[PDB]
Amino acid sequence: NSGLHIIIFDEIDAICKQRGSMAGSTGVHDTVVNQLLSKIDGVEQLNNILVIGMTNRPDLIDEALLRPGRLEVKMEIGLPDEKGRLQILHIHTARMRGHQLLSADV
Amino acid sequence: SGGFIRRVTNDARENEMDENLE
Amino acid sequence: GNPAIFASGIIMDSSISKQALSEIETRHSEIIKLENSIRELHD
Amino acid sequence: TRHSEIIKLENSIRELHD
Incomplete structure (x- = not known):
């Protein structure tokens, strides 16, 4: 019965x-x-942490750090399609549409 | 007579001390 | 030739020590006694 | 050398006292 602890690495390829x-x-x-590998999953066990990483060159990271049990969920974020563009454009103008600062011809 | 305080770290502080004693 | 190379890590070294500080206490303690004596003489 | 000088000083102080 313990809370959840979160850690965020930014530009992880710089160190690993x-x-x-x-x-x-x-x-x-x-x-x-070596220190990071040992700490994330060592002889002792933890069950209340979560680690998030972001990068732009995913193929330079050590393979041992990507096996299941350390960093399982791998996601690729790519360019949007038409529906995504429409949704983003709608998101980024709600305030103006709300306060009537946006003309009717747009 | 050659000194009065042992020199663990020397330094100016150990000199005046000794001289005063003299 | 070789590109510019980085320097390695540093390893400092503290000087003073616990036992040497006991010895410095030996040094310091007698001074107060000698002071009591001289104060007595002046008085 | 420390013992000699310190004991000499203490002896002189004691003589003055007495």
């Missing part, structure tokens, strides 16, 4: 990368990945 691909880093860009 394939182990050994980087070189001449003085080794600091390698122990971080």
Whole structure:
């Protein structure tokens, strides 16, 4: 009986990368990945955390970090189609339509 | 007579002390 | 040749120590006693 | 050297006192 704790990583590819691909880093860009891997799922178990990551180069991340049990739900966000464009346009003008600042010819 | 305070860290602070004692 | 290389991490080193501080207490303690003595003489 | 000087000082103080 415990609450939920949330963590948000932004631009995760900056710190997590394939182990050994980087070189001449003085080794600091390698122990971080091991620490993170051990902490997320180690000998001890947690059941009240949630981790969210965002990126733009999904193929550079270490494979061990994407197996089920650590980061399962992978999602791609792509460009919208016509209905999506109409919905977004409707969202971004509700205030103006409400206060009658929008002409009738639009 | 060669000093009065042992020098753990030296520093100016350890000098005047000793001199005063002298 | 080699591109510019980053420097490595630093490892500082503290100077003072617990036992050396007990020794500094040994130093300091006698001074107050000597002070009591000199104050007595002046009085 | 510390013992000698400190004990000398203390002895002088005691002599003055007495």
